[PDB]
């Protein structure tokens, strides 16, 4: 779970729901990019590291193709966002 | 305690109630020095006078034979409970069918306080009040 | 009259698509725009939908799906302790109830087309008993299961196609069920009937409280003697409102 967590920066409790429904809630700072979130998921879970892990919400379907997007632009604060490994 | 309900033995089949009564009596006798817990026995017979029902008459006769019968009740008590003593049957009201008979009266204010306190013993709904005072 | 009761108004959509969960709602409770929410609904209305949090457009009080709440007879303002419902998981082949009224207007095997559109990314509230916007075959295909005890909605793999019921459910039964005798018709005796109903419910909803009173709970409640107004109305309303045989 290597996520950029900082109290001074804007932290967001991103409840990253797994493919089985496991809401991996992480309070990642807004400065962290989507690459930081992907690295946190890979470190905390090797099942998504070995697969094409793209964060796609159920409603609506939008895969996290751009891993350079900052956590501030992601808008996943206190949100149950589904995650799938492909 | 051979508990006996009132509308229990009366069944649709012929002689089912009398057979059930005899079976219960025999089971209690062979079981122990049992007591016949005849619950709600008040509505069992209208003294066989107003008993226009032939099945009811047969039931009353079988009950009399079981109760009023030579060498019938050996160490076999009969817990008979009555709600309408007037509704009692003629033969049962006599000794031999029911040798003993008791009437339950209402309690006095002292007995009222006693029973009320005993019932209220489960809880404390007034810490600063005496239930005897209210009773 | 509870803290878990925000002021639920009608959502900007009659469905659960334009719900506006308050900033306080999104904060005190984990009330996301896209999170499964085990809210509270009346007449045994299990809501497990994902109500949007449109506090950005207006951080007003709670906004509730008007059509869905009306169909589920939900209370717009009730204590909707909307929690995640990930525990309720659906089976792979559940008895999905294909309604004849749902097919009454749908063209062809639009049930299969809608199921394909509904099996993965259903794009509708995940619950049962409410009015969810379901479009298929140029019609409203509400060919959904009435309810499933575990996961009334697809809380399983998106490909877990529940074995749809072969018989089509006619609209007459649905209308009869929807026209139920609720506690709303039980007005007037808002003192005596209310007291009796509270006595029954507390015995059912807080029997531990009655036991812990120190005194024994009431063994029962003999009902009021109605003077021919028709007590069957009150009895039916209570029986519908009560989960007892």
UniProtKB/Swiss-Prot annotation, chain A:
UBX domain ranges (all copies) = 7-84
Entry coiled-coil feature ranges = none
Superkingdom of the source species: Eukaryota
Which compartments is it annotated to reside in?
A: Nucleus; Cytoplasm, Cytosol; Endoplasmic reticulum; Golgi apparatus
**Subunit-structure text:** Interacts with VCP. Does not bind ubiquitin.
Function, in words: Adapter protein required for Golgi and endoplasmic reticulum biogenesis. Involved in Golgi and endoplasmic reticulum maintenance during interphase and in their reassembly at the end of mitosis. The complex formed with VCP has membrane fusion activity; membrane fusion activity requires USO1-GOLGA2 tethering and BET1L. VCPIP1 is also required, but not its deubiquitinating activity. Together with NSFL1C/p47, regulates the centrosomal levels of kinase AURKA/Aurora A during mitotic progression by promoting AURKA removal from centrosomes in prophase.
Please state which protein family the record places this protein in. Answer: Belongs to the NSFL1C family.
Record-given protein name: UBX domain-containing protein 2B
Native species = Homo sapiens (Human)
Whole protein: which stretch is covered? 246 to 331 of 331
Curated annotation (Swiss-Prot), chain B:
From which residue to which does any coiled coil extend?
none
Name the reported effect of residue 48 to A.
Does not affect methylation by VCPKMT
Give the location in the cell: Cytoplasm, Cytosol; Endoplasmic reticulum; Nucleus; Cytoplasm, Stress granule
- Positions binding ATP 1 in this chain are 83, 119
The chain residues annotated with the modification N6,N6,N6-trimethyllysine are 50
Q: Please report the PTM annotation for this entry.
A: Phosphorylated by tyrosine kinases in response to T-cell antigen receptor activation. Phosphorylated in mitotic cells. ISGylated.
Question: What happens after mutating residue 40 to Q?
Answer: Defect in ubiquitin-dependent protein degradation by the proteasome
Q: What is the effect of changing residue 122 to H?
A: In IBMPFD1; uncertain significance
Q: What is the effect of changing residue 50 to L/Q/R?
A: Abolishes methylation by VCPKMT
User: What is this protein for, i.e. what is its function?
Assistant: Necessary for the fragmentation of Golgi stacks during mitosis and for their reassembly after mitosis. Involved in the formation of the transitional endoplasmic reticulum (tER). The transfer of membranes from the endoplasmic reticulum to the Golgi apparatus occurs via 50-70 nm transition vesicles which derive from part-rough, part-smooth transitional elements of the endoplasmic reticulum (tER). Vesicle budding from the tER is an ATP-dependent process.
Give the family this protein belongs to, as stated in its UniProt record. Answer: Belongs to the AAA ATPase family.
Q: How does it assemble?
A: Homohexamer. Forms a ring-shaped particle of 12.5 nm diameter, that displays 6-fold radial symmetry. Part of a ternary complex containing STX5A, NSFL1C and VCP. NSFL1C forms a homotrimer that binds to one end of a VCP homohexamer. The complex binds to membranes enriched in phosphatidylethanolamine-containing lipids and promotes Golgi membrane fusion. Binds to a heterodimer of NPLOC4 and UFD1, binding to this heterodimer inhibits Golgi-membrane fusion. Interaction with VCIP135 leads to dissociation of the complex via ATP hydrolysis by VCP.
Domain comment text? The PIM (PUB-interaction motif) motif mediates interaction with the PUB domain of RNF31.
What protein is this chain from?
Transitional endoplasmic reticulum ATPase
Q: Which residues of the full protein are shown?
A: 266 to 400 of 806
UniProtKB/Swiss-Prot annotation, chain C:
Q: What is the effect of changing residue 135 to H?
A: In FTDALS6 and IBMPFD1; properly assembles into a hexameric structure; cultured cells expressing the mutant protein show a marked general increase in the level of ubiquitin-conjugated proteins and impaired protein degradation through the endoplasmic reticulum-associated degradation (ERAD) pathway; shows strongly reduced affinity for ADP and increased affinity for ATP; shows normal ATPase activity according to PubMed:16321991 while according to PubMed:25878907 and PubMed:25125609 shows increased ATPase activity; no defect in ubiquitin-dependent protein degradation by the proteasome; impaired autophagic function; defective maturation of ubiquitin-containing autophagosomes; decreased interaction with CAV1 and UBXN6; decreased endosome to lysosome transport via multivesicular body sorting pathway of CAV1; decreases the arsenite-induced stress granules (SGs) clearance process
Q: What is the effect of changing residue 120 to D?
A: Severely reduced binding to DERL1
Q: PTM details?
A: Phosphorylated by tyrosine kinases in response to T-cell antigen receptor activation. Phosphorylated in mitotic cells.
Disease linked to the protein: Inclusion body myopathy with early-onset Paget disease with or without frontotemporal dementia 1: An autosomal dominant disease characterized by disabling muscle weakness clinically resembling to limb girdle muscular dystrophy, osteolytic bone lesions consistent with Paget disease, and premature frontotemporal dementia. Clinical features show incomplete penetrance.
- UniProt: ATP 1 binding residues: 227-233
**Compartments, record wording:** Cytoplasm, Cytosol; Endoplasmic reticulum; Nucleus; Cytoplasm, Stress granule
**What is the name listed in the Swiss-Prot or TrEMBL entry for this protein?**
Transitional endoplasmic reticulum ATPase
Please state which protein family the record places this protein in: Belongs to the AAA ATPase family.
The annotated consequence of residue 178 to W reads:
In IBMPFD1; increased ATPase activity; impaired autophagic function
In the complete protein, the residues contained here run 21 to 265 of 806
Q: Which gene encodes it?
A: VCP
Question: Which of the residues bear the PTM Phosphoserine?
Answer: 17
């Amino acid at each position: 779970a290597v996520v950029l967590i900082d109290d001074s920066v804007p932290t967001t409790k991103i409840q990253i729901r797994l493919a089985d429904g496991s809401r991996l809630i992480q309070r990642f700072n807004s400065t962290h990019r989507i690459l930081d979130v992907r690295n946190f998921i890979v470190q905390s879970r090797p099942e998504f590291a070995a697969l094409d892990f793209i964060l796609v919400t159920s409603f609506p379907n939008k895969e996290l193709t751009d891993e350079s997007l900052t956590l501030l632009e992601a808008d996943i604060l206190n949100t149950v966002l589904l995650q799938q490994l492909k | 305690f051979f508990l006996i309900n009132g509308p229990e033995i009366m069944s649709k089949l012929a002689g089912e109630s009398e057979s059930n009564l005899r079976k219960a009596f025999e089971e209690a006798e062979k079981n122990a020095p049992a007591i016949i817990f005849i619950d709600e026995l008040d509505a069992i017979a209208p003294k066989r006078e107003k008993t226009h029902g032939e099945v009811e008459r047969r039931i009353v006769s079988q009950l009399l034979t079981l109760m009023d019968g030579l060498k019938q009740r050996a160490h076999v008590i009969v817990m008979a409970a009555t709600n309408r003593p007037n509704s009692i049957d003629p033969a049962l009201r006599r000794f031999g069918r029911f040798d003993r008979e008791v009437d339950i009266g209402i309690p006095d204010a002292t007995g009222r306080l006693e029973i009320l306190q005993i019932h209220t013993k489960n809880m404390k709904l007034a810490d600063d009040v005496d239930l005897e005072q209210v009773a | 009259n509870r803290p878990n009761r925000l002021i639920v108004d009608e959502a900007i959509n009659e469905d659960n698509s334009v719900v506006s969960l308050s900033q306080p709602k999104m904060d005190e409770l984990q009330l996301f725009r896209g999170d499964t929410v085990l809210l509270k609904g009346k007449k045994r209305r299990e809501a497990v939908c994902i109500v949007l949090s449109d506090d950005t457009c207006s951080d007003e009080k709670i906004r509730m799906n008007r059509v869905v709440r009306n169909n589920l007879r939900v209370r717009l303002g009730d204590v909707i302790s909307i929690q995640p419902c990930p525990d309720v998981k659906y089976g792979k082949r559940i008895h999905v109830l294909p309604i004849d009224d749902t097919v009454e207007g749908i063209t062809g095997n639009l049930f299969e087309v809608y199921l394909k559109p509904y099996f993965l990314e259903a794009y509708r509230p995940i619950r049962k008993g409410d009015i969810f916007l379901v479009r298929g075959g140029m019609r409203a295909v509400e060919f959904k299961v009435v309810e499933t005890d575990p996961s009334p909605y697809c809380i399983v793999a998106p490909d877990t196609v529940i074995h749809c019921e072969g018989e089509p459910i006619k609209r007459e039964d649905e209308e009869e069920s929807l026209n139920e005798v609720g506690y709303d018709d039980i007005g007037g005796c808002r003192k005596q009937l209310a007291q009796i109903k509270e006595m029954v419910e507390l015995p059912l909803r807080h029997p531990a409280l009655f036991k812990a009173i120190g005194v024994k709970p009431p063994r029962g409640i003999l009902l009021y003697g109605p003077p021919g107004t028709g007590k069957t109305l009150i009895a039916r309303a209570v029986a519908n409102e009560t989960g007892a045989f």
